[PDB]
Ligand binder design. Structure first.
Ligand code: 1WM
Ligand code: ZN
Ligand code: ZN
Length: 296
């Protein structure tokens, strides 16, 4: 059977929150079968735990934020993308502050941490959510869709008209049958438009942002001197973001996500909308890994 996966060892890193600029200690720990990913604010007394599930996502302008009462864990999407990409079912994530460290702006550092902790197979069948019927949500010209697919595929299109984006692909469709999440998706850095980052900074936000953790573009050019890690790094980061947000379903997906100018809010709306309709999905396991449309 395809087994559930956790970490072999506890592993740690430090960084700063992108939004808050606050130094934060991060700890990844093994967890028992059927735990899922659970965040813990260990700085608080008592310690507050928030399961990484769609229903616990709050309403914020930027990034995916988990909430329980007045307690938050901000910017969970890149770490969760790495967890999803490596097929980690169960883990505890301890944080000393209200935001996951931004690291280099990609999922790469979290992939590195997870790999370094080691991968531990557990004695229980891994559960998958299979999309049975197409479900969609929209807001203006933004659209997010789950489509049935015998495998795992993430497609995304952005639609920027600014000169800096002219001629760029702005679209990608990744079938993970033949694409490596680690090598071809995980290192895509977050990005922002200079005018928008200026606005955030004027409000004392984006305090942790720097040339070391984000690609900055103005209307006409990429400002980062070194260029891009992938030729289509921008849309690849949107795909990274979607994979992280989708992991709030609590299980790996058998299906396709299609995003059109979508973001964290719409991604979460899609999850809640899918979850509510039991005719549109089912939970499956694989007693024979060879008969599975995916592999970790
Ligand atoms: N010297 C110096 C140099 C640089 C800086 C800086 C900075 C910064 C920044 C920043 C802020 C917010 C985002 C952001 O939310 N990006 C989206 C994202 O990846 N979410 O996970 C992403 O999905 C997104 C969402 C909307 C959009 O229009 C573009 C990208 C990213 C980056 C300060 C000083
Ligand atoms: Zn423009
Ligand atoms: Zn992102």
């Amino acid at each position: 059977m395809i087994k559930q996966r956790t970490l072999k060892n506890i592993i740690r890193a430090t960084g700063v929150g992108l939004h808050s600029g606050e130094k934060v200690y991060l700890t990844l720990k093994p967890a028992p079968v059927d735990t899922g990913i659970v965040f813990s604010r260990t700085d608080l007394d008592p310690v507050v735990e928030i399961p990484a599930r769609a229903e616990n996502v709050g309403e914020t302008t930027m990034s995916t934020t988990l909430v329980k009462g007045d307690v938050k864990v901000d910017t969970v999407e890149h770490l969760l993308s790495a967890m999803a990409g490596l097929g980690i079912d169960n883990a505890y994530v301890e944080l000393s502050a209200s935001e996951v460290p931004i690291m280099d702006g990609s999922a790469g550092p979290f992939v590195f941490l997870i790999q370094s902790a080691g991968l531990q197979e557990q004695e229980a069948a891994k559960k998958f959510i299979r999309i049975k019927r197409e479900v969609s949500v929209e807001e203006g010209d933004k659209r997010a869709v789950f489509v049935p697919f015998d495998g795992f595929k993430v497609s995304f299109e952005i639609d920027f008209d600014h000169p800096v984006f002219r001629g760029r692909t702005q679209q990608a469709s990744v079938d993970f049958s033949s694409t490596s999440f680690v090598k071809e998706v995980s290192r895509a850095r977050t990005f922002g438009f200079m005018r928008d980052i200026e606005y955030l900074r004027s409000q004392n936000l984006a305090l942790g942002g720097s040339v070391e953790n984000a690609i900055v573009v103005d209307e006409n050019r990429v400002l980062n001197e070194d260029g891009l890690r992938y030729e289509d790094e921008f849309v690849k980061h949107k795909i990274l973001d979607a994979i992280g947000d989708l992991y709030l379903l609590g299980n790996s997906l058998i299906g396709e996500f299609r995003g059109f100018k979508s973001g964290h809010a719409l991604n979460n709306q899609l999850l809640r909308t899918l979850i509510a309709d039991k005719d549109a999905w089912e939970v499956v396991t694989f007693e024979d890994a060879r008969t599975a449309p995916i592999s970790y």
